Design a protein around this nucleic acid. Structure first.
Ligand code: 2TM
Lengths: 114, 199, 146, 76, 229
RNA sequence: UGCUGACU
DNA sequence: GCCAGAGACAGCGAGTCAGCAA
DNA sequence: CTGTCCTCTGGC
């Protein structure tokens, strides 16, 4: 059962959600349920590697840097609040993300962060 | 003939990396397509580039593409000799599987005499600097950091930190103690400017 | 002090379908001018029906002798020659004048929107005879069936 | 010399509070009060007339300070 | 049941958050610093502008500020502040930014002095570099460009530099949004330009008299920004 | 302090 | 020396009113 | 009832 023929490390399944836009409906997205950023760099001609997004924030912070993880943090908080119609002002998430990523790493806001 | 596609992508990415550091690179190298790359150049010793710096014409950089999928101390010495004899100071070693772990502290051991640096081959298949979320980084000069600290009445500690192994500090080749300006494209204010001390 | 006078005839009693309680929106159409009038009228006080004519006047003063109006309401006024040849008098203000849409065409027609507290009217037609109007201007809408 | 010329709301609050605590401790009122028993109303009357001899000492995050006059400060 | 459990978890989350971000206050130099002086942000919202005051600075709320202009100037800013404002330092900066962005429509095109001295590309590829190999890995034709540029160009008048220089840095960065009039965010001035262009083309066909001019509305919006800070 | 009820 | 085995270990919303027993 | 520590333990 735990014997797998072959798999990309970290990716469990892909899927092409055909439409994601009405303005420029022509968009196609290759969503995944695992996370391996470098194992997609080989398809820079099949897929758009700018516009690549992941909810991990530690993997983004390791392939693109910390100033790129700030915006993933902010967008994650915003999309978490959006499912309920709530809308916190961006000026608050900006400060939270700037404090969390202050000293170069994605640091938790908890007992070990103090 | 996928090895050639990989070689071409890596060479284009390294040309962009060398231009972003401020080295004399022509438009054709930055706009070189595959059909003409393969037309010019097959090997992994004639992909080695030597680039000059805008100022300090003596200050040039040398990019290596070792053959060994796992570079070792001896491989490092073999072309540290090349650098020492050709009279260059900087290098850039693109490795295909990694460096054996002793090598990483050897590259570090070579004092400012011959400062080297490694890049994996899978790290150069795309220019991270061209991602939507990655802002523009600009290494500040020694006279702009002083004016910054004077305007904000700061100390160099007490500033946000950027790791010395950051994927965008390794790309722009920023040593420790340097401040980098960062232009975030903000949906709120347009072009917010931040500063980070490299450490 | 008249800004407009004409003889209309009711064509539609309430086409949009929005139906209020004591108010009815008449869609009339002038005669000999082919001007258009949308008029909210209180029908509990002044019943109006289809195929009904009425002389309609818009004024800026009720005295018809030049003297301006003071903006104060006295039911005790001793000048009683104010227009009373009219059965239904209103009093509102113009809140929107908008030249018609047609470009590349003469299209020098204007639509004047007047509010009478909450009862709106729209006079649409040749601009030549809707010049007396201007936004924020107080006007009386006198009416008298025929 | 480089901070904002206006008087922040926190500064207005603290200046009114201090002037009121002074008036209440029998300090001379330079505003010609007109029958009001509240020291805070008197302090507002004084702030509106630009008669408050207090020096707001704005502290910068490194210890450096700037001394502004309550008269030379644009009260909104 | 879910209500009870949810509140039990939310209380702890909020306590942790509040216990870490509590010492961050805006300083007299508009920078958001912690208790020990560590700069978290160099401008609060990335532009300043606390939230409650930025509600009417959105577009689509200008036709309201324009309609109620006389009340807004008398009630708040007044003629006093409008004429005690001097906008030259910030206005010149935005003119420079606009000129730059006019000369560079695509702002991701790898500007450079030497890169700008690749327009002779045809001059070199025609006949000059037709005879060589990759001497040191660069090219046969790249070496001709390197030679022509390097020292065969003017000493101090080889100014391909100015055609390839950085965009002026944003105004809030250099010109202290609080004490500097007309120093606003790069996204607000775009909105103000768009609205001024769509408002000077409404007054023309308005059948009402407007006693406001595009350049008094601009000062109104700039003051209302500078005060929401 | 404890424990058993209860309120928003 | 490389990284699983764990096995401790610490955290778990705010306020309020009673009675009863020890 | 969960997630990091985090201090062994243990095997290699
Ligand atoms: N354990 C608790 C129970 C309540 N509360 C507080 O009391 C409010 C009203 O409770 P509630 O139960 O009446 C909810 P409400 O929306 O007012 O009810 P409705 O649908 O019948 O109108 C909650 O929203 C909390 O602020 C608390 O802090 N801890």
């Amino acid at each position: 059962h735990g014997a797998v023929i072959y798999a990309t490390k970290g990716i469990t399944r892909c899927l092409l959600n055909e439409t994601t836009n009405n303005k420029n409906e022509k968009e196609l997205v290759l969503n995944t349920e695992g996370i391996n950023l470098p194992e997609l760099f080989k398809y820079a001609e099949v897929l758009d590697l700018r516009r690549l997004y992941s909810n991990d924030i530690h993997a983004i912070a390791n392939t693109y840097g910390i100033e790129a993880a700030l915006r993933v943090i902010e967008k994650e908080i915003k999309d978490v609040f959006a499912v309920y119609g709530i809308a916190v002002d961006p000026r608050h998430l900006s400060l939270v993300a700037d404090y969390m990523c202050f000293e170069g790493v994605y640091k938790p806001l908890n007992r070990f962060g103090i | 003939e996928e090895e050639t596609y990989r070689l071409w992508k890596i060479r284009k990415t390294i040309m962009q990396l060398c231009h972003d550091r401020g080295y004399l690179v022509t438009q054709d190298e930055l706009d070189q397509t595959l059909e003409e790359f393969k037309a010019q150049s097959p090997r992994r010793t004639d992909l080695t580039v030597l680039v000059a710096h805008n100022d300090d014409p003596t200050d040039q950089m040398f990019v290596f593409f070792p053959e060994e999928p796992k570079v070792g101390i001896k491989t490092i010495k073999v072309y540290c000799q090349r650098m020492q004899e050709e009279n260059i100071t900087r290098a850039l070693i693109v490795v295909q599987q990694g460096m054996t772990p002793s090598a990483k502290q050897s590259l570090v051991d070579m004092a400012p005499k011959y400062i080297l640096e490694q890049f994996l081959q899978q790290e150069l298949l795309i220019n991270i600097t061209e991602h939507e979320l990655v802002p523009e980084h600009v290494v500040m000069t020694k006279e702009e950091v002083t004016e910054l600290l004077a305007r904000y009445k700061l100390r160099e500690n007490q500033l946000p930190r950027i790791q010395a192994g950051d994927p965008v500090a390794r790309y722009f080749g920023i040593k420790r103690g340097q401040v980098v300006k960062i232009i975030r494209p903000s949906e709120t204010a347009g072009r917010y400017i931040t500063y980070r001390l490299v450490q | 002090g008249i800004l407009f006078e004409d003889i209309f005839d009711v064509k539609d009693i309430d086409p949009e379908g929005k139906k209020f309680d004591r108010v009815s929106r008449l869609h009339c159409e002038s005669e000999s001018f082919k001007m258009d009038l949308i008029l909210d009228v209180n029908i509990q006080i002044y019943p109006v029906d289809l195929g009904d004519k009425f002389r309609l006047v818009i004024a800026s003063t009720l005295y018809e002798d030049g003297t301006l109006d003071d903006g104060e309401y006295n039911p005790t006024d001793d000048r009683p020659s104010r227009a009373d040849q009219f059965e239904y008098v209103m009093y509102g203000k113009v809140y929107r004048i908008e030249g018609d849409e047609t470009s590349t065409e003469a299209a020098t027609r204007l639509s004047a929107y007047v509010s009478y507290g909450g009862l709106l009217m729209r006079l649409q037609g040749d601009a030549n005879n809707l010049h007396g109007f201007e936004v924020d201007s107080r006007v009386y809408l006198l009416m008298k069936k025929l | 010399r480089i901070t904002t010329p206006y008087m922040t709301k926190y500064e207005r609050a603290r200046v009114l509070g201090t002037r009121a605590l002074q008036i209440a401790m029998c300090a001379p009122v330079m505003v010609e009060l007109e029958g009001e028993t509240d020291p805070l109303l008197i302090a507002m009357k004084e702030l509106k007339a630009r008669k408050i001899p207090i020096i707001i000492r704005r502290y910068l995050p490194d210890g450096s300070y700037e001394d502004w006059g309550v008269d030379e400060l644009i009260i909104t | 049941v879910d209500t009870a459990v949810k509140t039990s978890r939310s209380g702890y989350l909020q306590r942790c958050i509040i216990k870490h971000l509590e010492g961050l206050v805006v300083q007299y130099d508009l920078t958001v610093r912690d208790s020990d002086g560590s700069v978290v942000q160099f401008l609060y919202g990335e532009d300043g502008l606390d939230i409650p005051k930025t509600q009417f600075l959105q577009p689509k709320q200008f036709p309201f500020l324009a309609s109620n202009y006389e009340v807004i100037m008398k009630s708040q800013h007044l003629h006093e502040v409008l004429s005690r404002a001097d906008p030259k330092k910030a206005l010149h900066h935005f003119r420079a930014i606009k000129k730059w962005q006019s000369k560079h429509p695509n702002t991701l095109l790898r500007r450079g002095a030497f890169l700008s001295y690749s327009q002779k590309i045809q001059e070199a590829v025609k006949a000059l570099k037709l005879e060589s190999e990759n001497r040191n890995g660069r090219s046969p034709g790249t070496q001709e460009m390197l030679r022509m540029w390097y020292e065969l160009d003017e000493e101090s008048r080889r100014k391909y530099q100015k055609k390839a220089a950085a965009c002026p840095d944003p105004s809030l960065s250099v010109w202290r949004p609080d004490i500097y009039f007309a120093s606003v965010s790069e996204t607000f001035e775009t909105k103000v330009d768009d609205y001024s262009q769509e408002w000077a083309a409404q007054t023309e066909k308005s059948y009402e008299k407007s006693e406001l001019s595009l350049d008094r509305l601009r000062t109104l919006l700039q003051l209302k920004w500078q005060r929401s800070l």
